[PDB]
Coordinates of C-alpha atoms and ligand atoms in Angstrom, one line a residue:
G1 CA -55.1 -53.8 -18.5
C2 CA -57.7 -56.1 -16.9
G3 CA -60.8 -57.7 -18.2
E4 CA -62.4 -61.1 -19.0
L5 CA -60.6 -63.7 -21.0
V6 CA -62.0 -63.8 -24.6
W7 CA -59.2 -65.6 -26.5
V8 CA -56.2 -67.8 -26.2
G9 CA -53.5 -68.0 -28.9
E10 CA -51.6 -70.9 -30.5
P11 CA -49.1 -72.7 -28.2
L12 CA -45.5 -71.6 -28.7
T13 CA -42.8 -74.1 -27.7
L14 CA -39.8 -72.3 -26.1
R15 CA -37.8 -75.4 -25.0
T16 CA -38.1 -79.2 -24.8
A17 CA -36.9 -81.6 -22.1
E18 CA -34.4 -84.2 -23.2
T19 CA -35.0 -86.6 -20.4
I20 CA -38.1 -88.5 -19.1
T21 CA -37.5 -86.6 -15.9
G22 CA -39.1 -83.6 -17.7
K23 CA -42.2 -85.4 -18.9
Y24 CA -44.1 -83.1 -16.6
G25 CA -42.9 -80.1 -14.6
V26 CA -43.2 -76.4 -14.1
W27 CA -41.3 -73.4 -15.5
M28 CA -41.8 -69.8 -14.4
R29 CA -40.8 -66.2 -14.3
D30 CA -41.2 -63.6 -11.6
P31 CA -44.1 -61.2 -12.2
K32 CA -42.6 -58.9 -9.6
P33 CA -38.9 -59.3 -10.2
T34 CA -36.4 -58.1 -7.5
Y35 CA -32.6 -57.9 -7.3
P36 CA -30.6 -59.8 -8.5
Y37 CA -33.3 -61.1 -10.9
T38 CA -35.1 -59.5 -13.8
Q39 CA -38.1 -60.1 -16.1
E40 CA -35.9 -62.4 -18.2
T41 CA -34.9 -64.6 -15.3
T42 CA -36.5 -68.1 -15.8
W43 CA -36.7 -71.0 -13.4
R44 CA -37.3 -74.6 -14.4
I45 CA -38.2 -77.7 -12.4
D46 CA -38.5 -81.3 -13.9
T47 CA -40.9 -82.8 -11.4
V48 CA -40.9 -86.5 -12.3
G49 CA -39.8 -88.7 -9.3
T50 CA -40.0 -88.8 -5.5
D51 CA -36.9 -86.8 -4.8
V52 CA -37.5 -83.5 -6.7
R53 CA -35.1 -80.8 -5.3
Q54 CA -33.2 -79.3 -8.3
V55 CA -34.3 -75.9 -9.6
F56 CA -32.7 -74.7 -12.8
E57 CA -32.2 -70.9 -12.8
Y58 CA -31.5 -68.9 -16.0
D59 CA -30.5 -65.3 -15.9
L60 CA -31.3 -64.7 -19.6
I61 CA -34.2 -66.1 -21.6
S62 CA -31.6 -67.0 -24.2
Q63 CA -29.8 -69.3 -21.8
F64 CA -33.2 -70.8 -21.0
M65 CA -34.2 -71.8 -24.5
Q66 CA -30.7 -72.6 -25.9
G67 CA -28.2 -73.0 -23.1
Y68 CA -27.3 -74.2 -19.6
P69 CA -28.6 -73.0 -16.2
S70 CA -26.7 -70.0 -14.6
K71 CA -27.4 -71.6 -11.2
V72 CA -29.0 -74.8 -9.7
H73 CA -30.8 -74.5 -6.4
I74 CA -31.2 -77.5 -4.2
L75 CA -34.5 -77.2 -2.3
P76 CA -34.4 -77.9 1.5
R77 CA -37.2 -80.5 1.1
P78 CA -38.7 -82.6 -1.7
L79 CA -41.3 -80.8 -3.9
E80 CA -44.8 -82.0 -4.8
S81 CA -46.3 -81.9 -8.3
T82 CA -46.3 -78.9 -10.7
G83 CA -48.3 -76.3 -8.9
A84 CA -45.3 -74.1 -7.8
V85 CA -45.0 -70.4 -8.3
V86 CA -42.3 -67.7 -8.2
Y87 CA -43.4 -64.3 -6.8
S88 CA -41.4 -61.3 -5.6
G89 CA -38.1 -63.1 -5.2
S90 CA -39.4 -66.3 -3.6
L91 CA -40.3 -69.8 -4.8
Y92 CA -43.6 -71.0 -3.4
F93 CA -43.9 -74.8 -3.5
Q94 CA -45.6 -77.7 -1.9
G95 CA -43.7 -80.1 0.3
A96 CA -43.8 -83.7 -0.8
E97 CA -46.6 -85.8 0.8
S98 CA -48.1 -82.8 2.6
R99 CA -50.5 -79.9 2.4
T100 CA -47.7 -77.5 3.4
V101 CA -46.7 -74.5 1.2
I102 CA -43.1 -73.4 1.6
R103 CA -41.8 -69.9 0.9
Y104 CA -38.3 -70.3 -0.4
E105 CA -36.3 -67.1 -0.9
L106 CA -34.2 -67.7 -4.0
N107 CA -31.4 -65.1 -3.5
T108 CA -30.6 -66.2 0.1
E109 CA -31.7 -69.8 -0.4
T110 CA -33.7 -69.4 2.8
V111 CA -37.0 -70.7 4.0
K112 CA -39.0 -67.6 5.0
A113 CA -42.4 -69.2 5.8
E114 CA -44.3 -72.4 5.9
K115 CA -48.0 -73.0 6.3
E116 CA -50.5 -75.8 6.2
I117 CA -53.3 -75.0 3.8
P118 CA -56.3 -75.6 6.2
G119 CA -58.3 -78.7 5.5
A120 CA -56.8 -79.0 2.0
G121 CA -56.7 -82.4 0.3
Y122 CA -53.3 -83.6 -0.8
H123 CA -51.4 -86.5 -2.5
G124 CA -54.2 -87.6 -4.8
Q125 CA -57.3 -86.5 -3.0
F126 CA -58.4 -83.7 -5.2
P127 CA -55.9 -83.6 -8.1
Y128 CA -56.7 -82.3 -11.6
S129 CA -58.1 -84.8 -14.1
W130 CA -54.6 -86.1 -15.1
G131 CA -53.7 -86.8 -11.5
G132 CA -50.0 -86.3 -10.7
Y133 CA -50.7 -85.1 -7.2
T134 CA -51.9 -81.8 -8.5
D135 CA -54.1 -81.2 -5.4
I136 CA -52.6 -77.8 -4.5
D137 CA -51.9 -75.2 -7.2
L138 CA -50.3 -71.9 -6.5
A139 CA -51.2 -68.9 -8.7
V140 CA -50.2 -65.2 -9.3
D141 CA -52.4 -62.6 -10.9
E142 CA -52.7 -58.8 -11.0
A143 CA -53.5 -58.8 -7.2
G144 CA -50.8 -61.1 -6.0
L145 CA -50.5 -64.7 -4.7
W146 CA -53.3 -67.2 -4.5
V147 CA -53.7 -70.9 -3.9
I148 CA -56.2 -73.3 -5.6
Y149 CA -57.2 -76.5 -3.9
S150 CA -60.2 -78.3 -2.4
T151 CA -61.5 -79.8 0.9
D152 CA -63.9 -82.5 2.1
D153 CA -66.4 -79.8 3.1
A154 CA -66.3 -78.5 -0.5
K155 CA -66.8 -82.1 -1.7
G156 CA -63.9 -81.8 -4.2
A157 CA -65.1 -78.5 -5.6
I158 CA -62.4 -76.0 -6.4
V159 CA -61.5 -73.7 -3.5
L160 CA -59.4 -70.6 -4.0
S161 CA -57.8 -68.5 -1.2
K162 CA -56.0 -65.2 -1.4
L163 CA -52.7 -65.6 0.3
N164 CA -50.3 -63.2 2.1
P165 CA -47.0 -63.6 0.3
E166 CA -45.0 -62.8 3.4
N167 CA -46.4 -65.3 6.0
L168 CA -48.7 -67.4 3.8
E169 CA -51.8 -66.6 5.9
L170 CA -55.2 -67.0 4.2
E171 CA -56.7 -63.5 3.6
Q172 CA -59.9 -64.6 2.0
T173 CA -61.5 -67.8 0.6
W174 CA -64.1 -68.6 -2.1
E175 CA -65.9 -71.9 -2.8
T176 CA -66.9 -72.7 -6.3
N177 CA -69.2 -75.5 -7.6
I178 CA -66.6 -76.8 -10.1
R179 CA -65.3 -80.3 -9.4
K180 CA -61.5 -79.9 -9.4
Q181 CA -60.9 -83.5 -10.6
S182 CA -63.2 -82.9 -13.6
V183 CA -60.9 -80.2 -14.9
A184 CA -57.4 -80.4 -16.6
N185 CA -56.0 -77.4 -14.7
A186 CA -56.8 -73.9 -13.7
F187 CA -55.5 -70.3 -13.4
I188 CA -56.5 -66.9 -12.2
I189 CA -56.8 -63.7 -14.3
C190 CA -57.8 -60.4 -12.7
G191 CA -59.5 -62.1 -9.7
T192 CA -61.4 -64.6 -12.0
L193 CA -60.7 -68.3 -11.9
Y194 CA -60.6 -70.1 -15.2
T195 CA -60.4 -73.8 -16.0
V196 CA -59.3 -75.9 -18.9
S197 CA -61.5 -78.8 -20.1
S198 CA -58.8 -81.3 -21.2
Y199 CA -55.1 -82.0 -21.0
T200 CA -54.9 -84.3 -24.1
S201 CA -57.2 -82.7 -26.7
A202 CA -55.9 -80.4 -29.4
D203 CA -59.5 -79.1 -29.4
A204 CA -59.9 -78.4 -25.7
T205 CA -61.5 -75.3 -24.2
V206 CA -61.3 -72.8 -21.4
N207 CA -64.7 -74.1 -20.2
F208 CA -65.5 -72.5 -16.8
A209 CA -65.0 -69.2 -15.1
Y210 CA -65.6 -68.0 -11.5
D211 CA -65.5 -64.3 -10.6
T212 CA -64.4 -63.6 -7.0
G213 CA -65.8 -60.1 -7.2
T214 CA -69.4 -61.1 -7.9
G215 CA -69.3 -64.8 -7.1
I216 CA -70.9 -65.6 -10.5
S217 CA -70.1 -68.8 -12.4
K218 CA -70.0 -69.0 -16.2
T219 CA -69.6 -71.6 -18.9
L220 CA -67.1 -70.7 -21.7
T221 CA -66.0 -72.3 -25.0
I222 CA -62.7 -70.5 -25.7
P223 CA -60.5 -72.8 -27.8
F224 CA -57.3 -74.2 -26.2
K225 CA -54.8 -76.5 -27.8
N226 CA -52.7 -79.1 -26.1
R227 CA -50.3 -79.5 -28.9
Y228 CA -48.5 -82.5 -27.4
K229 CA -51.6 -84.0 -25.7
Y230 CA -50.4 -84.1 -22.1
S231 CA -50.5 -80.7 -20.3
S232 CA -49.4 -81.2 -16.6
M233 CA -49.1 -77.5 -15.8
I234 CA -51.1 -74.4 -16.9
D235 CA -50.4 -71.0 -15.2
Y236 CA -51.0 -67.3 -15.9
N237 CA -48.3 -64.7 -15.7
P238 CA -49.9 -61.3 -15.0
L239 CA -46.8 -59.4 -16.1
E240 CA -46.4 -60.8 -19.6
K241 CA -50.2 -61.3 -19.7
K242 CA -49.6 -64.9 -21.0
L243 CA -50.3 -68.5 -20.0
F244 CA -47.3 -70.6 -19.2
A245 CA -47.7 -74.3 -19.6
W246 CA -45.9 -77.7 -19.6
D247 CA -47.0 -80.2 -22.2
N248 CA -45.4 -83.6 -22.6
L249 CA -41.7 -82.7 -22.3
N250 CA -42.4 -79.3 -23.9
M251 CA -42.1 -75.9 -22.3
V252 CA -44.8 -73.7 -24.0
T253 CA -46.5 -70.3 -23.8
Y254 CA -49.9 -69.0 -25.0
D255 CA -50.9 -65.4 -25.9
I256 CA -54.2 -64.2 -24.5
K257 CA -56.6 -61.4 -25.1
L258 CA -58.7 -59.6 -22.4
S259 CA -61.8 -57.5 -22.7
Ligands
LIG1 CA1 -52.4 -73.8 -12.7
LIG2 NA1 -49.4 -73.1 -10.3

């Protein structure tokens, strides 16, 4: 069920952080769940601070919006920003003050792989427009794991590389002409990169698209609402066919429609 994005729905709040620690963060579900996890298993990370290690894990979506965690993982090293992703039983996150992506197997609590994203800017070089060290942004779509970033050679333009989920080797790389810092966030649907215009506006838009298949760039004007006017995280879940987002203490989801 692939196609081009033609519509985004109203934001739906599933849960709200009670502490300033959760001002921005990342929540997630596995698009390719494996034992002992299911499609309902939800992970949460409040990413405010310099010592971000705690990952809240919820077996049931019910626990996740109305209860306590079923488990809390302590990451081996501090985590950077809100770009993390869970895929096929592993948490993929960026080590604090680095351009290193770590593959953290959740069930075994083991580090299975680490790789330096070649030439990638980090720690405030090429963040999204709101800052927050969002230089490196992992993504999952119908084809698997990606990483969104930029380099000096790209002059801050969004670069996206297809990643091997086992060893984190770059399989292929595309260079866009979209300034990453000029955009609120980005995600990938069916091999097409999309960007959001603003992180504060209730009247923002999905304003750009870049297709890896054809290399064509396009301007869009699909409405997109930041209900709480501070979206720190915007990701696409290819299983639910939905956008997951974190907006000013609030854990939200958007419905979408594809051509
Ligand atoms: Ca994103
Ligand atoms: Na991400």
